Design a protein around this ligand. Structure first.
Ligand code: 8SO
Ligand code: GLU
Ligand code: GLU
Ligand code: ZN
Ligand code: ZN
Ligand code: ZN
Lengths: 260, 260
């Protein structure tokens, strides 16, 4: 009976360093939605666990040439971690190599603008050129655009892939900062969950505009053949039914919201 | 190989009799979201299939005394069907006896009123007696209320379980017809998907009021040990990623709107 290695990612408000982390040990160093969720998954499934921050800071993409998976998906695939409890999007390319639980949170790709940017939709972005637009450089949002068979998203991808300087960002923080600094001339494509979060953070200068471009979810991911698979999945279901997932989202998004 | 027996339920706009169904045969008798979904899933998984409407007309619940499952769940449990492709809610008690794919559609419990009924929320319903309210029998909505420890919803359950005459209905159509014919004196608790469909149908005399009471999904269900499980699961993800699930939702909800 071993300590389960949990891979996760420093992404607010899912996992954050506590103020006093240097004075704390192990799992107590971290706080956030996924920290709370990991404690509950572990309790319901009856395992001890160790939170680990993904080494490369990435979510998980497979390199076209080397076929190597990076990020948290890589850590699962290569057996460096036993479970990923993180804002990790359920995707087909990932579900082909790892198992996901039923989604614990819903999201879709969305548009973040600096307040007062004349953009209402993904159509509005594709039709103009004054406002630059991009995504996280190594995640499911980028892959949505790259793998699309849909005309308008193919159009947006074609712009983004060739845009100079690069419209892609290394971290959500960088995307958000870029929106805040580009005086309305950069829009960021990111998941609605992160968009919603940032809209409630000081200095309250960004907002989600328009509908989501897709509808999907984050799931808890395990390597194929994990003994944790069934129990993790039932735990997610139990926690949803008991209202905990809604409670945790409110706790980390809205209850401490800085924008009124 | 073998023709896959698909259990489903006559529920608008998921599976409906075509207007000229009397002159049609087999699968061709039916149209709707789940009819289109079945066709797509069968195509991506490489099986032939026969749509069969669930004999007892129910979704599925377990008798507390006999432990026997009825409805589509029962048909899977007892080997009468190979797969359920229907607006079947993923729930813990079900996921313990059958497997669910990733959700193909999101929904939450909601309130339908006859237009002008002075009810805005579940709280409003709980605080009065003049307007009766109920749910579908042998479904997940009833179970939600049965199990809820939320004071508003427990108060509601306490009332509904004892209410005379019975506030529960056999079919969604019966719930909706009850709302329409009770002059505002009956409200109906049903899933947001069905509520929102009905709101856009003639005679446009109902509406959804308040927020959803929960957030969950419909899943394609297979009996435990099914050779279809993984392929069906991936097929749902492929269909979502292609935008096909979104296309089907628009086809059956909003393009089929009669209320403007
Ligand atoms: C990759 C996709 C195919 S998807 O699998 O993400 N679904 C796509 C479809 C559009 C969709 C259906 C339902 C949800 C949803 C997510 C989380 C919750 C909270 C609890 N989730 S739960 C217990 O599983 O119902 C409820 C609902 C999300 C998406
Ligand atoms: N949740 C995403 C990362 C964020 C994004 O791509 O926008 C993923 O799992 O790749
Ligand atoms: N979708 C529900 C039926 C409708 C309801 O209970 O409101 C089920 O699977 O039981
Ligand atoms: Zn620090
Ligand atoms: Zn718990
Ligand atoms: Zn297809």
């Amino acid at each position: 009976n071993k300590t389960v290695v949990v891979t996760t990612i420093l992404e607010s408000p899912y996992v954050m360093m506590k103020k006093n982390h240097e004075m704390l040990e192990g799992n107590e160093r971290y706080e956030g939605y996924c920290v709370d969720l990991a404690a509950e998954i572990a309790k319901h499934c009856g395992f001890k666990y160790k939170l680990t921050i993904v080494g490369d800071g990435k979510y998980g993409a497979r390199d076209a040439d080397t076929k190597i998976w990076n990020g948290m998906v890589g850590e699962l695939v290569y057996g460096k971690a036993d479970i990923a409890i993180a804002p990790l999007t359920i995707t087909l390319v990932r579900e082909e190599v790892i198992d996901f639980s039923k989604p614990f949170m819903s999201l879709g790709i969305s548009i973040m603008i600096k307040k007062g940017t004349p953009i209402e939709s993904a159509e509005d972005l594709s039709k103009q050129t004054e406002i630059a637009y991009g995504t996280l450089d190594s995640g499911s949002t980028k892959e949505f655009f790259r793998r699309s068979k849909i005309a308008v998203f193919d159009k947006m991808w074609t712009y983004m892939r060739s845009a100079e300087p690069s419209v892609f960002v290394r971290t959500t923080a960088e995307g958000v900062a870029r929106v805040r600094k580009s005086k309305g001339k950069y829009a960021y494509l990111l998941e609605s969950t992160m968009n919603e979060y940032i809209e409630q953070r000081k200095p309250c200068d960004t907002m989600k505009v328009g509908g989501n471009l897709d509808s999907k979810g984050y799931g808890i991911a395990t390597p194929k053949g994990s003994s944790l698979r069934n129990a993790v999945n039932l735990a997610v279901l139990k926690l949803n039914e008991q209202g905990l997932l809604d409670k945790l989202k409110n706790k980390w998004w809205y209850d401490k919201g800085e924008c009124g």
